[model samples]
Target: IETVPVKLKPGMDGPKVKQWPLTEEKIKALVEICTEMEKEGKISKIGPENPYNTPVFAIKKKDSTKWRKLVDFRELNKRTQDFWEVQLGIPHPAGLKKKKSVTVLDVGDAYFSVPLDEDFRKYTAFTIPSINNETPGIRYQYNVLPQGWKGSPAIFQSSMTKILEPFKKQNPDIVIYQYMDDLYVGSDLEIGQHRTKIEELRQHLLRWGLMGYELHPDKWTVQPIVLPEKDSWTVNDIQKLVGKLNWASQIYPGIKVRQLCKLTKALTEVIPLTEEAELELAENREILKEPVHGVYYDPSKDLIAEIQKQGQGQWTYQIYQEPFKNLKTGKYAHTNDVKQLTEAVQKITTESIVIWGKTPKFKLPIQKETWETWWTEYWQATWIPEWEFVNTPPLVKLWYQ
Candidate 1:
């Protein structure tokens, strides 16, 4: 049922594609469906003068009453209104603390149930080529939202969600998660409670005048277990253990959940430590073992970054005294003891800025009194020259001094 009618919203017009040629076997079935659908008001025969048309075709069913008729709307859809790339939400049931079940209700002939706006029907017309001398060349257009229309999925979903929103608000405890035509009704409560809610939902659909639903009762059990006391762990076991640890550690101040990261990627990645790497990891791990209260840090003392030069022009810069150690939680650390830099280290990248040939932008070039001390730290020797000149006074030989 179209609570809101769908708009084809064409941005372009005047491409009337001829129907794709059909074989003799498919011709009779196709014509029969067209005739039936015309009577049902799903589609109507329009005159050949319609300005837009797409090729329409049908697929024979294995053992069913109707042929699967569709339009080749790919060309038409390309010119329809733009839709955002957001994913439709489908809430798969949360694992139960005990036993649970999922009852999926697939709404029948979902797309055809919505009425397309009469103003937009011109864009959805399709040609039915003459199959014989008796049947003349004609164009048939959709009266209801069709399967191949660009906007039908979202259009139908909006209508369906609006229809279900009342049911959701009235019985908030009976969970219904929707993804277009499929509605998943889940519960950890009794299976009987689910049936009662389902029939209740059916009546709502009836009152709304939307098409009814068919059911697929799926069964599952959310059994709890202690991960079988692993001698060694696989990726699956590690993931399960990590999930539990992550959840439990949320309230545990002492466990310091991040330390468990190694166990998460324990194999595909590293436990490698050259004597240097090992020292770096161990150093940060010890520093972070306790919470923020156990440690004392002086901003001036904690350089947090370093640059070193060898006798030749070789030099390197790094995150801390050692590789990359976690800064805050501190052991969320991935250590690196790298080897080389340029032949001449003209620039050193710092935590705040990358030092090149002169100091960075902020300068209230302070008194020449504290000049040497302040200059020594803020602007590295590689970059200090322009630091004093830009913001410092001109050679004021005769002013105040």
Candidate 2:
């Protein structure tokens, strides 16, 4: 592999790989888990005929000592113009949002397969599948899913979407999210209209292909919705939680166990304790059954605000660790410098963090016209966390020769 141009001199202080070893106990435990998973028929067998493929790769910089992305798309991106155009700023719509009135029925644990035909039919692709999301009442079915399908999540989602397509065309006010069977539908919220709409959705589920009905009213909810009559009413579960917190004074916001669970998922990165965090997450999930909602981080009185408020002056402490690059010898100091840089990025953000070569396309030094349009129209004061593309150091070779 080609290395970076810059070299760290030999004797500097830096993190180093202390040991070249793997624990026997850890490997044995992994083997046991794999064996059990296979025994339960949850593990998929990889074969040449299978369409799914999984590979891992990493990104390294030119003239730099750090690695950035763990994903390398040199080959895959080449085959699809979608990836190339997006990267090159041809800006196709970021994935499609199906039309409205589509009731998306989500299956919670659809990843585990139930059997079909005489053999264990491992799902092969994410295209349309037989088991749609339509469920009427309930009945028992036989089958366990054999493991190892890359398209499992998409397949389940697609199946549900296909089931709802006809209804979507009729209602013209529905959009469904089929995430690995975890479905959520965004729809028109007129009170009189919604009851019929929702029931029809239920009927469609039964009429189409759903295997069973586990109606936990507590798990599902119907909240008061308000929208402009002109534009279509769109519901995003995340935005719903945000509005709940923001408008609590008016609604006396009842328990938002679900919102908090979402927050706990968000906050896991910012906090320290692992076990305690897990407990908090479980508690949050439990609390979703209650009438409690989360409070927005009020800038006038939030922990983040207080911290920044205190750091307004130069009262902050700073320590300069000596650079890992050694001055004396010509050789690089530490082999593991890349790992440290990667960790710095991973542990720091609630949003997606990206790295690229050269000053990234979006972050700093954005053009005035582009910045205004992007910030006002696209971001609307909120950071485009996912869309805000990043760039790493550029590969520039120059010589006086």
Candidate 3:
């Protein structure tokens, strides 16, 4: 692969930091991690000075005393332009068939496996305490992709996809889905066929010299989602909890609207965890008993329509439908009829018509350009205005409703 350019934002300066004094144990761990990477040709020794360098710090491994080396990429990110990221969607586990099994493969050190272009390596340089006193204070740079780099995720994903292109072509029946370094191969095939498919993936990883890549047994089955169980809440906490509930409602169809309403109320007011709030939480917990299963709706395959009440006397509606579909007769069917409905509705609400060389007249007072036009002319004239708006006279309300 040729060198990829690292384009920084204009008038930006590289960041520098003084190395932290380390204990014997920490120094040993750092040296071991760096030395192993160097041996694997993942990093290279660099002189004390560099044009662009970032600081290094040790992040403790989860539930372990061991440390993982991380670079401070805040400065780099401030100056660097974002790469063209490939938009990827999460595979909905609910889409899996009842009898089908899912195998999730995780690539080890996924970011490190992808080599950095020679030109980009210098930008990843970080200072480290010298392993030996002979070279008092030394720093190094990564020849391979580093974890903390802003563009590393996109670069690694793109490279991994490129490497797996051939394998994907050979095994078209097996649907390979990727989310970062984790790859999923799911099918309704029998046990033997599933194992064969997984083995084929293993072979591909090995052929590409990707070591330690294996299927995750823990996530072998669909994992149940456990909602937040906090007894006390802060404003920020409730905001996050409310945001999560919104996402959960979309994924689980049977989620209680009443409970969501209460949570949303709490979110807006940021009320203290009072008795009513506790009762609301209890009801929320009760709603989690049975999980709802649904097919993941691919926007590319099916039509979707959304209707949202923005506020008082206001609503917004949107629709998206594919232009064609395969019929029961095994032939393509045109869906321009459905497409026309969306266009017609949008046009009617948004635009005014010159009927007999005059615009349609509206009676009730209205506010906001986006809403007033949709309301008095198209919406209210067709049906009674919602409760928030003033009720129309009995005869007019009856005619519209």
Candidate 4:
């Protein structure tokens, strides 16, 4: 099923053919396959010696049932230049995650279906030495594109793109993405809107001599909208709590700081109820009433970030910000346009160094805290055990030592 022939570089030097050593069992297997392929018209015997000849080897199957033959085209590839002009633009994983439903199509036996050019078949010829005097040398080459050919992927990809063009036009609203033979059908609309398109696309693929199957529903799982509750938890609970919060943060970028602070309480050892601790928890929960805003910056986009003004003596810094504009829509984009908005805001707020002046030489100095003073204050507030410096009994001494 050769679709096209590859053109080799001008004045390319053909590689010297090398014979690969094989066991009797592998030779018999390889002979059987080559003879069978001859009968199937996929390969043919040639009397004339080809300029380029690749070596073949047997690869054992994962289950050790049998060995599969593979062609070593390393030399041919070295002399060949990849001129694949197709550029595949796939949606980002985040973009796909945002979709309501996705249909995955796998093209079975992808490579062998495409026909290789007859002119290029001579370049792919290989020879296995005769095991016995009675057995002649097995010299053959592929008429269809072989799995191990260096340029096979690009060739097949181009062929599939042309075959799928009609389907793409028919379903202009729904997205039909392809990476090699694997096709993906998705839309911002619900599953019902795009479900029919999957079948239509499958029909189109079948019409173009390709077979595809949709992945099972059981293989795909959606993120949980609500996390389960836990009781009588320990230090290990923090990991599960964090996992839930992380997933929630992705789906809901506007998660409140009060809710997060309350979640952080699970990181430490929980003790019996105390009035002060309960009061602090209540206060943190009440702070959720305050409005929160998110900010983000992507280096990929056009940005013009700078400090507009500085407070007296650099005690306070003020920023005059402009709205972000989306190039696609030509409209002002909001904080929601920023991916992981909450995480972006958290990074800026928790960043250690933030310059506050317009020009470095023409600005007021920002008041900064020294690590030495902070460390001294920290040591003053920490408690030390008196027993650490006192004498110990023989058993205690042995344990300490």
Number of backbone-clashing residue pairs for each candidate, in the order shown: 3, 37, 0, 7
Tens digits of per-residue lDDT for model 1, 289-366 = 434332333333322433333233332232222122212210000111121221112122211221110112222223
Top-TM-score structure, candidate number? 3
Ten consecutive residues with minimal summed lDDT in candidate 3? 324-333
Against the true structure, candidate 1 has what lDDT? Answer: 0.45
Position 325, candidate 1: lDDT: 27
Return whichever of 1 and 4 wins on TM-score: 1
| Alpha-carbon lDDT, every model | 0.45, 0.29, 0.48, 0.45
Tens digit per residue, CA lDDT, model 3, 1-401: 55455454557655655565555565677788788878888888887558666766554543256666656564565456334222322223333223255565655466666667776677787766754555765578888766655466455655677777887787665555543334556656666777887787788787675512233222222223345766556666666555555545554555543443454244334455654555554665465443344433243332332232223333333222321111100001123322332233333221211001011112222233434223212211111111112223432221111
lDDT (tens digit, per residue) of candidate 2 on 1-401: 22112122234321111111113332333345445545666443443443332221122333233322121122222232222233322211111122223233434334454333322231121111112333321111113321222123333434555777888889775544332223445454544455567667777766554212212112222122221122222234333433443433233244233433343144222323233334433443344333324332221221110000011121111011121111110000132322322222221111111001001112222234443232311111101111232232221000000
Q: What is the alpha-carbon lDDT of model 3 when measured against the actual structure?
A: 0.48
- How do the candidates rank by lDDT, highest first? 3, 1, 4, 2
Per-model TM against the reference: 0.40, 0.24, 0.43, 0.39
Give Cα distance to truth, residue 249, candidate 3, Å: 15
TM-score of 3: 0.43
- Whole-model alpha-carbon lDDT for candidate 2: 0.29
lDDT: the better of candidates 1 and 2: 1
How far does residue 283 in candidate 1 sit from its true spot (Å)? Answer: 26
